[PDB]
Amino acid sequence: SAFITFEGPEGSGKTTVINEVYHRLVKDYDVIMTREPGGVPTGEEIRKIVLEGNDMDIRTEAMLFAASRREHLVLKVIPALKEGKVVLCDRYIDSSLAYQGYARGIGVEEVRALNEFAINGLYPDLTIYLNVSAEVGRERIIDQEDLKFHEKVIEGYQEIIHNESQRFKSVNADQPLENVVEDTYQTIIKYLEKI
Amino acid sequence: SAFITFEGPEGSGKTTVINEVYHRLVKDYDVIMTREPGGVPTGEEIRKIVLEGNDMDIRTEAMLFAASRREHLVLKVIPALKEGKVVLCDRYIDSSLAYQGYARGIGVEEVRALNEFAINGLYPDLTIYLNVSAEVGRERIIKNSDQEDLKFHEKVIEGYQEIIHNESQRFKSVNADQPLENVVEDTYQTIIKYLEKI
Ligand SMILES: Cc1cn([C@H]2CCCN([C@H](CC(C)C)c3ccc(C(=O)O)c(Oc4cccc(Cl)c4)c3)C2)c(=O)[nH]c1=O
Numbered sequence: 527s528a529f530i531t532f533e534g535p536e537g538s539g540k541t542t543v544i545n546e547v548y549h550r551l552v553k554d555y556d557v558i559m560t561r562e563p564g565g566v567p568t569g570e571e572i573r574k575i576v577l578e579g580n581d582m583d584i585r586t587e588a589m590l591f592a593a594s595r596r597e598h599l600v601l602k603v604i605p606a607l608k609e610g611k612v613v614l615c616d617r618y619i620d621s622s623l624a625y626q627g628y629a630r631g632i633g634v635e636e637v638r639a640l641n642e643f644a645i646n647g648l649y650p651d652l653t654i655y656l657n658v659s660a661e662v663g664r665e666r667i668i669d670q671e672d673l674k675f676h677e678k679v680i681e682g683y684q685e686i687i688h689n690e691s692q693r694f695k696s697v698n699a700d701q702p703l704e705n706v707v708e709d710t711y712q713t714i715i716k717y718l719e720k721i
Numbered sequence: 722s723a724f725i726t727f728e729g730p731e732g733s734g735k736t737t738v739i740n741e742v743y744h745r746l747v748k749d750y751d752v753i754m755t756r757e758p759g760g761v762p763t764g765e766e767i768r769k770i771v772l773e774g775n776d777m778d779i780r781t782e783a784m785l786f787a788a789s790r791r792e793h794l795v796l797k798v799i800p801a802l803k804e805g806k807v808v809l810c811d812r813y814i815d816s817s818l819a820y821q822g823y824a825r826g827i828g829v830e831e832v833r834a835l836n837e838f839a840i841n842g843l844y845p846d847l848t849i850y851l852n853v854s855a856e857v858g859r860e861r862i863i864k865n866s867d868q869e870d871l872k873f874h875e876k877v878i879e880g881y882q883e884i885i886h887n888e889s890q891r892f893k894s895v896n897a898d899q900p901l902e903n904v905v906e907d908t909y910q911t912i913i914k915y916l917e918k919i
Pocket residue numbers: 562563569572573576577590591592594617618621622623625626
């Protein structure tokens with residue numbers, strides 16, 4: 527089994543990359559595609575609060591993303607891993623770190639401590655970082671402040687990878703999507719074939 | 722201003738103590754009484770998830786108590802403190818510590834780290850711990866309303882003892898084995914003495 531997470535800002539081609547990579551891995555592996563809350567009842571209820579929340583305090587929002595993460599992990603991820611599946615998860619811990627921690631200004635290490643409470647040692651076996659430049663990302667989408675938030679999300683991701691370089695595999699997402707799909711597939715297969 | 726929290730297991734007479742104490746203090750101070758979620762929209766929605774939760778993961782439940790705590794703190798507590806009020810809060814951090822941390826087995830220090838994210842340095846100025854024995858507590862529970870509930874109640878008390886032992890400077894332990902009139906008087910006197918030294 528394997529727990530593979532996908533990270534990157536909007537315009538990184540993340541969603542396209544997961545779909546095509548799932549299509550190829552399913553020939554050789556029992557693989558599932560997921561994202562939080564991913565249909566988990568309690569997680570779905572939390573998602574509604576996040577999306578209905580008008581000017582919600584940033585720390586509350588961070589705790590809700592972490593509570594949805596726990597539910598999804600416990601009820602969806604862990605049982606799929608026990609069935610021997612390869613789990614392709616669209617966004618996990620690093621998304622809270624880059625968004626809530628860095629871009630929102632709470633601080634990466636504070637959002638990390640929160641998320642380590644939520645994941646309880648369950649870090650991904652592999653994390654695919656779709657390394658898109660702010661310029662390519664902006665064009666790939668789809669206002670200022672939004673442009674600034676997008677850049678800050680990317681700066682946050684740069685900070686996460688610079689401090690932790692083990693499970694992270696940075697794929698050049700500035701390339702055409704066919705090459706991003708191939709580089710991601712090859713990275714995954716190489717990891718999976720080494721157990 | 723002052724941020725005073727009230728802690729204790731069920732059967733400690735907490736609710737009666739806070740209600741009667743508030744009623745006396747209101748005569749000399751600009752005071753409010755609150756509990757989480759305390760009518761805060763987002764906190765109320767979180768409470769519903771907690772209560773609708775069937776065999777819910779303990780860490781999720783802990784994060785929901787902490788998210789409700791943040792909302793209540795930010796929208797109710799902090800603005801009252803800024804207006805110079807005395808804030809009487811029925812259950813706060815220590816409740817998560819004793820229940821989620823200790824009694825539920827997550828660990829006090831882990832539930833503390835979670836709650837320090839939520840409170841962001843806003844610890845109570847004073848914590849009133851209603852020190853009831855498990856035996857007295859168990860008897861008070863019967864009047865106000867199995868072995869599994871008996872054991873959890875004892876663990877909650879043991880957990881509160883562990884918290885108080887490591888943070889004695891913040892707490893004021895009031896003997897809650899006494900009749901409630903004396904528990905009310907001892908709590909009122911403890912509060913007044915703290916408030917008059919401000
Ligand atoms: C996983 C994760 C993602 N994000 C970002 C990623 C980029 C999209 N955004 C937004 C933020 C919203 C308040 C406008 C977003 C977009 C679509 C959805 C939707 O599902 O419809 C969404 O709701 C979600 C998604 C995941 C979990 C929960 Cl609890 C709610 C949230 C969320 C974070 O900031 N932190 C995290 O931990």
